[PDB]
Amino acid sequence: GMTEYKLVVVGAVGVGKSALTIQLIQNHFVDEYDPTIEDCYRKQVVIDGETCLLDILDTAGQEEYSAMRDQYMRTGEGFLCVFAINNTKSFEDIHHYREQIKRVKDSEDVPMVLVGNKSDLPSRTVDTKQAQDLARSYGIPFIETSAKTRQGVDDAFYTLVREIRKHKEK
Numbered sequence: 001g002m003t004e005y006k007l008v009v010v011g012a013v014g015v016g017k018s019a020l021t022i023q024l025i026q027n028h029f030v031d032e033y034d035p036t037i038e039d040c041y042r043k044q045v046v047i048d049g050e051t052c053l054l055d056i057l058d059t060a061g062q063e064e065y066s067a068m069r070d071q072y073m074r075t076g077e078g079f080l081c082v083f084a085i086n087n088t089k090s091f092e093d094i095h096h097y098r099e100q101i102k103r104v105k106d107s108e109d110v111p112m113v114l115v116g117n118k119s120d121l122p123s124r125t126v127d128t129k130q131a132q133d134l135a136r137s138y139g140i141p142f143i144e145t146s147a148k149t150r151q152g153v154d155d156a157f158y159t160l161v162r163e164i165r166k167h168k169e170k
């Protein structure tokens with residue numbers, strides 16, 4: 001089979017995880033999608049000439065059993081850590097997602113990309129500089145996105161695939 005990249009989208013409720021995923025997969029903006037639904041999605045794409053499958057888990061937070069969270073973290077190869085540029089708490093929450101994923105995978109080298117979503121809104125509490133400072137501390141890419149206009153969306157997911165490739169070649 002063609003290579004499949006297992007991607008996991010994490011972040012506080014309301015940041016745009018579902019909107020980002022649906023924009024990536026279906027090329028439309030869905031402005032109301034139940035915040036409590038956690039589902040997988042698939043898309044066959046070409047990234048730098050490689051035909052591959054994106055197998056994406058759109059997370060929704062707590063699980064019936066914490067074992068289910070640990071399971072998807074171990075299964076996932078790369079993580080989109082999403083905050084919204086108008087939600088400071090969601091930005092602060094990134095520290096917890098970073099820690100938890102590393103903790104479950106028992107790894108210091110987990111492919112991740114920092115994503116600041118809702119860039120189409122002038123209303124902003126997290127400046128680009130602040131997010132750059134955090135991404136610098138982590139040594140991971142940082143991309144501002146709009147699930148509404150599609151700006152940065154392919155970049156966010158394709159960058160995560162590229163980070164996974166860098167991890168695999170070691």
Ligand SMILES: Nc1nc2c(ncn2[C@@H]2O[C@H](COP(=O)(O)OP(=O)(O)O)[C@@H](O)[C@H]2O)c(=O)[nH]1
Pocket residue numbers: 011012013014015016017018019020030031032033034035117118119120121145146147148149
């Ligand atoms: N303006 C704007 N609204 C967005 C964007 N992404 C998501 N939203 C809205 O933010 C709300 C939460 O989005 P959702 O995808 O359900 O967030 P999730 O809980 O992280 O899955 C919805 O009302 C979406 O329409 C975006 O990039 N721009």
Ligand SMILES: *SCc1nc2ccccc2[nH]1
Pocket residue numbers: 006007008039040055056057072073075076077
């Ligand atoms: S629902 C199929 C599925 N489960 C996943 C876990 C982590 C990353 C991708 C996944 N797809």
Ligand SMILES: [Mg+2]
Pocket residue numbers: 017018019033034035036037058059060
């Ligand atoms: Mg959602």
